[PDB]
Amino acid sequence: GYANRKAIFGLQSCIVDYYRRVSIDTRLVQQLYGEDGLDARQLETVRF
Amino acid sequence: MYADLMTRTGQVTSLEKAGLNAREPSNVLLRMALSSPVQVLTDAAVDSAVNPIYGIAAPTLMGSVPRIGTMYSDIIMDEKYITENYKS
Amino acid sequence: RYAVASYGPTDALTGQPLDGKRSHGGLRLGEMEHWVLTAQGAMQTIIEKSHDDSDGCISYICRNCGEPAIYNASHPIYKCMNCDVQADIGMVDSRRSSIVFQHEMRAANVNITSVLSPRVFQPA
Amino acid sequence: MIDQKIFETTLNIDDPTNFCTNVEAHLLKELENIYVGKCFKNSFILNITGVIQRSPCFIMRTNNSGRGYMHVRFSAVVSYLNAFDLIAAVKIIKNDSNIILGESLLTEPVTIVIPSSESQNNVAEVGQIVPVQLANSSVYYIPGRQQASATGSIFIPKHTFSVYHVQEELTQEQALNLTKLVNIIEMLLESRSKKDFKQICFFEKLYYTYSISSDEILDLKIWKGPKGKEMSRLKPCNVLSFLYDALKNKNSSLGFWARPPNLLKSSPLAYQQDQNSFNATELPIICSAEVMFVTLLKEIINYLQFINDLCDTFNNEQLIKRHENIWMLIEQRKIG
Amino acid sequence: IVESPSICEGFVQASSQTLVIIPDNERITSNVLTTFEATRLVAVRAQQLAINGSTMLKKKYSSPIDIAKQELFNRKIPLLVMRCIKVTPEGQKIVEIWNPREMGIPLLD
Amino acid sequence: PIEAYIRQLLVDPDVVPIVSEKKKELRVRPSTRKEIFLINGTHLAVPAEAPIEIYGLKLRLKTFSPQCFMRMAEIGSFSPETLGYVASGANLTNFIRVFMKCVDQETWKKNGEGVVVTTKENIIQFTHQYIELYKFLRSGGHSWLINRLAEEMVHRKLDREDQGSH
Amino acid sequence: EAGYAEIAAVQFNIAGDNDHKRQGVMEVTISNLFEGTLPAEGGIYDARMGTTDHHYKCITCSHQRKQCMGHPGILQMHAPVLQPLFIAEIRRWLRVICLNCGAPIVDLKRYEHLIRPKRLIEAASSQTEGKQCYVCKAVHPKIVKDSEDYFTFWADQQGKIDKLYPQIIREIFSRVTYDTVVKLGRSKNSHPEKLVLKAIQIPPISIRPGDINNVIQYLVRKNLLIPKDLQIVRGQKIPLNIDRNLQTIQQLYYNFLLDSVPSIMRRLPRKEGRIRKSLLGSQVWSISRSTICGNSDLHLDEVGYPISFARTLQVAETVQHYNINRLMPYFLNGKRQYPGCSRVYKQITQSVHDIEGLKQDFRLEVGDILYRDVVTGDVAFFNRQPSLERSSIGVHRIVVLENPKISTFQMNVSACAWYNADFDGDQMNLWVPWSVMSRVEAELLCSVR
Amino acid sequence: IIGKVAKIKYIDRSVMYGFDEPAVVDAVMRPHGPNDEIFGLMRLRYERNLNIGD
């Protein structure tokens, strides 16, 4: 609980904008979310 | 997400009160909500801090809702469609 | 087990329901529940629960100076005790606990001025 | 003064679907229902002229009501009242020991409080219609009120004037600005000629600073009114002709300008001299031509409005006799 | 010298903005509604139907939610999506306007 | 009436700081804390009641941007006196400079440009001109002028961003 | 007439005397509390500051208890006081400026390269005792903090000791120019003159309904004791009773604001404080809780809901032309049969009516809001604490259990993986959305699928 | 369950049974406190079988 509340108050301002970037109100945290721009619920494990 | 946040400024910042100060210094309301409101509020007053409302805690401490999810994009009435298709 | 109502006893300070079964108040949607609802994007549920069902109210703020204003549709009052001739009052959806919170900060000689979102106009 | 103003506001919309069927008509209707006949932003809105530009109908974001809102930037015909302004018809509504209350019956709704300390007052009995002049104080425009709050007293003509020392020429841009006040003067003059000449003569003889010697009317082909005293050998000049000539850059506006009580305030006459030959009781005010032109012009608008609206309010001799006490108080206080 | 504060500063009221709409051929955001956007559209339409009740839907439904969902699916919803892109320091508010009656709907029924 | 009353009334605005030289002439106590200057040019404040001697009066001719006047007209609720004061400050008008410029000489100089008056008669003239200038700013004149100016400037800005553009 | 608006930014500043004088709605002048059954005018309970009892409305906004947010008052202090939260800041200003002419002692240009938050802090950190002024020729003393309280300052000039009374500090600070403030980093709104108060703000009744009021009353009572025409000059000897009265007033104010940091600022900090308990969390209505239970006949997206709870929680249906026929059977049942209703909101009268108090209405009028019972097929938010994952709150389709002997929330065992739950005594919350907007959002976003 | 009025004409300082499950009044008595002042003592009983969720 101590670690969860400090992680959320440090990370909660990160929000996906209209470019799929992650930013804090103007300021880039990621150029693309997850570096691939995908949702984690929409992934398939596939062999190359 | 953790590493990109902690390394955003070119230095490794922490998930403590000190790290929040480095990344979001002007977000007093976020910073007040984390650990120590009285010290943060006192510093904000003498510094004349301007706090833009963004994220989750800053809207929440002001009684509003975050501009996130369903609230991210705003809806406007289709003025032209209604005139052609609807009646008073 | 517990299930309460749309209404009941209310705290005099925060304006929120009382605590739990014994006081016949409500149950708590805590800090971690708002994290989950925010993570899900369910913002209209946060309005329904944390505003409509807890203490949500209307705060009136003058555009010209950012201070709380006084508005009353019946018995017409439209005034601001900082500018008082150039008042431009806009209603903001707030909650009573937040207005009390801002009153407490002003009691500590900290001035809270709210910059309202500016008017936007079509260029036509 | 009736003028044009531009306001910004936000209107709430309870039924966005029905509102958007006719946005311009509904917008004008709501603006008229909200702002016409009230005080807002240091002015009194008389009419909603139009909507310069607006916003899309957004949907309220911080509540689950589904209602809309719209930013509107609209032009309105408003009124503003200044100090020393002449109101020719205010009705006394309450006369007690504390204060006197009056409500103006004109197109500029203002309620005037009147102190009882002055001997001019305490004579306008309840129900009388007297002309008053506002004090040298700002007229209060409390938001949401249907009148304006002002202070003033029953108008007694003053025996003191001012001298303006013009050391700066009039620019052509300033002349093009002043021609609007010139046109207002023309409109007031041509509206005055349509009224009753006997009423004009009586009301100008009544409020003349001196006492008119006998029936004698000067006609300048644009302003017609009884003649008063002169000032030795000094001759007045028409301000309107001087301005129209200064449009052609043919006259010098420098020197000592003055309007002594000998002139009729409603007339466009003025005294320009190369020397301070006026018997002023105060230091001449150093300024430019624009300042003095604006002051004298606005004075002429004020007194033209005063006289014309006095004649409009008092149409029959019955009200003249009913107000003969006010007229006696007016006539008694003149310098010999 | 830095003298006393003047009226030129001390303004609390932010200056008004001009809504700058990106031309339709220069829009960068996706032509597919997000789940958040579709949910918001359906919720707003359902609430407005609870207010007014006037719809151009041919079929008959007993709930505002069903009518709103079928309006979204049949491309008859009288709403627009405005995606606020940027607020310029010189006053402009650059946005993109999207017509949900010609976008891809993620929801299912 | 007395010169003390007038020269104490004029000290109220943040404009017109005063220069002080320890002597026996023009003793004034302001009605609030006032930032004054000394001969040889040193800037010091004095509390709400301090006997300061008036070597002379220096009004600083404030300068602004037309953007400030545009913002005030955008708000659209300021008094005509404040509107005209800022308009003269932003050079949209010239009333402050045309009522004044009774400057004696370059008797005292520093960073801020303005009107310096260091003598008996011309201090009286400066006070009279200040009184007349603010009586003009509050009068019926310059109320029509400033309102017309603000309305036409904002309307032209709207038209040029609306009709002249797209 | 008040248009819709939102807050885009918030500014923080130090509130001086002028702010309190503008924002205050009345001046506190008497220590009487109540005049009969009404609050005493001029006291700390004056109705111009708001109403908390149903016996009266607010004089200022003419609202009842619920719609009035309170309005602040003014208390004119007979002797100036220092601001309790900014005492440290006061110290930083006493160690930099000259105490006799107001000019700076440190070299301002020496600290120009620093960032403006740190300029004053690092300029005051340097030793300044014994320094000589450049414009008035005065030796700067050392400002020693009194060790027996949080607010008293002394000036020590080579062993000569003086007590810096708040009026002396105010007179010293009012001699500072705005150029000094700006060149020392602080903003024009942070002039040190605001750090000494002669008019304090009596907080609105909305934040002290009904311990804090005791402190305020004691403060007013002791303020009245101080002579109204008291004057303090640097070095003047003070009568002992007056000195202890000034000490009592300042200590009362300090305990009113920062006691053990009843005080205003103790309401904020901890988990039970204002921010974490009232703002970040919330007590809510229309919610239920019960022990959870297993049921293998329920689908994974279904929750078993007792009928007794289904008739407590309600769903708000707005009566229109497309649902008048469906909503009519709910209206006829009332609170006697299931499924029924409990309450109707009428737009014609703009009020809420119980369903037993109306029986002459043949049908409902379009525009009314019927609060009906929860039925099978309704969506419900279903939550187990602690909510550590995104699936800790999920939306389930309600199945109402008609057996009156069942008091548990029943769900399929394969649905336990969402909530990290089991059936050894866990309790889960359940609230049913009633508004259309939240009830749309439950289906489309928050469904457990 | 217990009626109690304070004399101002009167204000009702009563006690209402705020529980979902009905009870049965098992014992009622008016004992004397440490200050020799009357207080009301009531015992309420509930017939508790084993039921789902126990």
Ligand SMILES: [Mg+2]
């Ligand atoms: Mg367990």
Ligand SMILES: [Zn+2]
């Ligand atoms: Zn205001």
Ligand SMILES: [Zn+2]
């Ligand atoms: Zn109130």
Ligand SMILES: [Zn+2]
């Ligand atoms: Zn010194």
